[PDB]
Design a protein around this ligand. Sequence first.
Ligand code: EU9
Ligand code: MG
Ligand code: MG
Ligand code: MG
Lengths: 408, 406
Amino acid sequence: SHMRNIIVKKLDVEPIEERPTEIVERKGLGHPDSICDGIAESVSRALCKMYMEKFGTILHHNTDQVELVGGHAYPKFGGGVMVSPIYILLSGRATMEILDKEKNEVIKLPVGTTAVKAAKEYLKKVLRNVDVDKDVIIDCRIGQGSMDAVDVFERQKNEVPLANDTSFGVGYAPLSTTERLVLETERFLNSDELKNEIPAVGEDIKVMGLREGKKITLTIAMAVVDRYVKNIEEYKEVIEKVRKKVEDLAKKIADGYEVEIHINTADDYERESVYLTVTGTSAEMGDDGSVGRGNRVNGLITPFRPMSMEAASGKNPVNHVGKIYNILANLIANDIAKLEGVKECYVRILSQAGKPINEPKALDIEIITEDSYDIKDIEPKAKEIANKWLDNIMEVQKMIVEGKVTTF
Amino acid sequence: MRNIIVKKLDVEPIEERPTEIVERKGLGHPDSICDGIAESVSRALCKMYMEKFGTILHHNTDQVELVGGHAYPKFGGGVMVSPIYILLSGRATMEILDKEKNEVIKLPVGTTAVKAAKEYLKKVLRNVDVDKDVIIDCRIGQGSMDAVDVFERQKNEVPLANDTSFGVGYAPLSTTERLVLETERFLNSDELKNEIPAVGEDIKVMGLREGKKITLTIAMAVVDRYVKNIEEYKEVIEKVRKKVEDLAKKIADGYEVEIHINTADDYERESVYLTVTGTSAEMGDDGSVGRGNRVNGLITPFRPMSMEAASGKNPVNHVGKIYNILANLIANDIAKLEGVKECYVRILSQAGKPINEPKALDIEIITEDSYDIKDIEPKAKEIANKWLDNIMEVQKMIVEGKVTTF
Ligand SMILES: Nc1ncnc2c1ncn2[C@@H]1O[C@H](C[S@+](CC[C@@H](N)C(=O)O)Cc2ccccc2[N+](=O)[O-])[C@@H](O)[C@H]1O
Ligand SMILES: [Mg+2]
Ligand SMILES: [Mg+2]
Ligand SMILES: [Mg+2]
C-alpha cells in the first residue's frame, strides 16, 4: 500500500524502426575510453568489497576519474616493438582512515594498493596481448579521506540513502535491430570463441552502425595484432575472414535488412599504411582515453535516443543517485518492454532531495503501444514493475558491486 | 552527390513538452577547466606548427586530467594546502626526421603546451596563484604512423576524416536552455566580476522546467578574500540573485522563474560555499575532458547529443570537432527558415573519407503548423550543401577562436 510519483503516458509517435534513420556506436573493451571506464568501475567494486569485508557496509568514494596516456610502439609484420609503456593515472577519492574517539583507535584501509591491484587485474582480464608487467604503468593519485566512526556506525544500518541532490536518469527498451547488431558485433568480435579462431583480432574494436531505411551500414575499427600477420597479404585475409563472420552474424539477428560492412576504412594498402598494432589496442600509441566519453550504461552511444551525460563508471553505488537512476531506468524499461502490447518504452527518473532515493520526485514512463492495445491495460503492470524495482533498490546496489549490470 | 537526408519529424516540440532538464558547467568548473585547457593547448600547437612549417601538423590534445587540490577557506582570505595537479595529455607530432642530415629534430610541444595551459588558467581564474596553487605536468606523446599518414594524405587538398564519428546540432535554443546558458555567461562576464569580485568562476547552473515553471539551481563558488564575514557572503548571494531575476525577466517572459543559489549552505554553522581560488578544484574535486558541456555550451538529456569531446581535437581533420561545429552551424541557418519550428542535424563520417563527404548528413525538421516539408526540404538541402562547400571556413572559425568547443 505504498504510493509513489509514477507517471504512465501513451507516447503517440513513430517507433524507432519506422523512423528512416538511425546512428549507433559502441566502443569495445580494448578501446582506450572503455579501458578507462572499466578500470574506474573495477576500482570502485574493489573498494566496495574492501569496505564490506571490514565494516559490512560501503563507505564514501568515487573513482570515476581515470586517464590513459597512449604509449610508444613500432608495429611490424611478424611481431613489433613496445617502446614506452601505457601510462594510466587513477584519480578520484575514497574513505581511507576511520577516527574512533570512544575507542582511542584509528582504522586505516588499503585504498591505494587495492585500487592499483584492481586496475591491473582488469587489464589482465581483457587485454590478451598486453604484458601488464612491462607494457603498463598504473599510477594513483586517489585522494584519501577520513571519517568519524559514528558515521560508520550510521552507515552500517544500511538504510536506503537520502537523495542529496536533484538528479536525473534515463533509459529505454527494447533495443532496435541496428542497436542490437552494433552491440552483438563488438561482443562477438571480442568473444573467446572468435579470438581462438582468429587471434589476430585485437580487443580495441569500434563499431559504428548507420541505418538508412532498411539498409544498415556497419563500419568497424579493429586493431590487428602484428605477431599473427606475417605480411600485408595475411592482414587482408584477416579482414576478409572477419567480414565473413560479421555477415553471418548479420544474417542471424538482422535478417530482412540489407547489411553492408566496412572494416578499417583508413587503411591504404598501396602505401602500406594499415591498422597494425603490437598489443591489439591503439592505447599502445595511436590513441588516449579517459572516463565518461564512451558508451552509456546500456553499452551504446545513441544520438536518436535520450542520453545522460553523467559518467556512471567509478561512481559510488550507494549514494550517487545519477548512477543508480541511469541503471535503474534501464532495468525498469527492459522489464516493461517484455510486457504484452509494449512496442517501445522510455523511463525517466528524477530525485527528490532530502527524500530516499527510491522515493523519486517523478518517475516518468512513456509507452508506445502495439496496435489494438489499450495503454490503460498495460499501465497497472508497468507501475507494478517500477514499484518492484524501487522496493528492491538495495538489490540494485548489490548487482552493481557484483558486476551483474553494465556501466558502459 | 552528397549524402544529405531531410525528414519531417512529427513529435511534440521541446517547449510544449511538460519537462525539461538543462545544465551548464561554468568556466571555473573542474571539467570545463579541462576542456578549456585542452583547446588552449591545441590552438597553441597549431600556432607553433604554423610558425615553423607554415602548416598544421598532426595532433589531438583532447586529454586533460585535473586532480583536485586542498585548501583552507577563511573570511578575509584563506590559503591553499595542496596544489591542484593537472596532467596535459593527448597525441602530437613531437619530432621530425631530417632525411638529409639523418637526424631527429625535436619540436617544442612540451613547452608550448605547458605555457598555454598556464596562460589559460590565469585567464579564467582571477584568484589562482599558478606558481603555488597548481602543478601542470605534461605527457603528450607521438601519434601513430597510420594517424599521421591519414592526416597528411590530402592535407593540401580536402583533409581526410581522422575517424569514424558523428556530430550533432540543433536549433533554436529553448527558453530554459537560453536561460541556463546566459545566466552562466553573464555571471562569468568581466563586467559582473569587476562589479562583484566575490563571484568565483566555478558556476554550475541547472535548469529544471515543469510546465511554465523554471527552477534555476546555481552552485557558485565565492572568493573568500572579498567577503569579511557571513553577512557579506549573504549580501553577495542576494546581489547575484537580483541580477539573475532581472535576467530571467528579460529572456524568460511569461514563465515563473525560481532561483536557488548554493542550496547546501548552512548559515547557522557558517558552513558555506567559500573558496580561496574561486574553483571547487581546490576542494578535492576532479575534472577531465568531455565530461561537461557540448559545443553549444549545454548538457541536454532532452536533446540529441554526441559523446565526442570537441575541445583539444585538431581543427584540420578531426570530425569529432568539425562535424559538431558544422552541425550547429547548419541547424542554426535552417532554424531561420519560415515554417521551421525545430531542426536537428546529425553528421556522420567514415575514417579516411574527405571531410566534405560525410557518410550521412541527417536533417530532421519539426514544421510550423500548416507548412509543407516539401517546401522546406529544398532550402534545407541548399543550406547543408552551402556549408559543405565552405567546410574549410569551420577550421578557419575554430583557429581564429570565433567559436566555442564547450
Ligand atoms: N589505424 C586505425 N584505423 C582505424 N581505426 C583506428 C586506427 N587506430 C585507432 N583506431 C580506433 O579509433 C579510435 C580513435 S583514434 C583517435 C585519433 C586521435 N587519437 C589521434 O591522435 O589521431 C582514431 C585513429 C587513430 C590512429 C589512426 C587512425 C585512426 N582512425 O582514422 O580511426 C581508437 O581508440 C581506435 O579504437
Ligand atoms: Mg576518445
Ligand atoms: Mg565531473
Ligand atoms: Mg570520438
